[PDB]
Structure 1
């Protein structure tokens, strides 16, 4: 099973100048809980944005060019990325925009955080078709001293 996990600001913005400009510790904790002990697939730009391997997860990087770091696994196509995960129950695709586009048709589950924040970005989560997806979990949180915007954790499953 393939799942996508992402945090979206207003208008499905997910990034700006290869960075995420907000800081929402509660959402990063949600990301860690839902990805720990699973393989994570990311594109090369997202690998550069994170800047280090994510511990406790098999890190698989998509790139058309040879890898430059043997602490992670480098693959050259979607099918190779999936194969490199082995026989696991759930593969987590962690972006970015181009990678989300390619894996969305193959995904059964979306873990989405909706952040009530406006930021002028250059990368968006794919337009998906709402009729294809059922909301099975949602949890709203107001802003607090640690998290400066309100946010909503949602899990969608393909109908």
Structure 2
């Protein structure tokens, strides 16, 4: 099955100028790693270029990058369509789609699960997560956490299934 995972600040904002528009929340990164470890991850080229080299390729995961153009990094698998991205995952229990905006828009109609981090921050953005709440998603997990010394905004992890 196909799953999307995303951090959304207020009004579904997920990015600004190819970066996330809040300071790093290490607890959200630890949630991301927990949920994506040992699964293939599919990402657009802008998202691959936004991950610091210190954690690239994402370890313990098969990294699959969408680009219409030839690949520029032999360390990961490059693919030129959605169908090619899915094929490279192989027969596994769950495929994780990790962004960005144009990638999420294409995969949301195919997904049976969403892993969302809701961040209590009103920030400016140029990229939003697609409208999902109107469809037939039901929440099956949620967990709120207050801001602390290592995370400067409060956040709420959520899993929804179709």
Shift of 1:118: 1.2
TM-score by length of 2: 0.94
List per-residue Cα deviations over 1:68-122 (Å, max 9, x = no partner).
1110000011111000000100000000000000000000000000000011110
List per-residue Cα deviations over 1:3-37 (Å, max 9, x = no partner).
00000000100001100132x11000000000011
- TM-align CA RMSD: 1.0
Aligned pairs, number: 157
Runs (4+) of structure 1 exceeding 6 A deviation are none
TM-score by length of 1: 0.96
Shift of 1:131: 3.9
Question: Aligned equivalents of 1:71 and 1:151: distance in 2?
Answer: 33
List per-residue Cα deviations over 1:24-58 (Å, max 9, x = no partner).
11000000000011000000000111183111100
Shift of 1:130: 3.1
Shift of 1:129: 3.9
Unaligned runs of 5+ in 2: none
Contact 2:14 2:21 in 1 (8 A): no
Unaligned runs of 5+ in 1: none
Question: Aligned equivalents of 1:120 and 1:21: distance in 2?
Answer: 7
Question: Aligned equivalents of 1:130 and 1:9: distance in 2?
Answer: 18
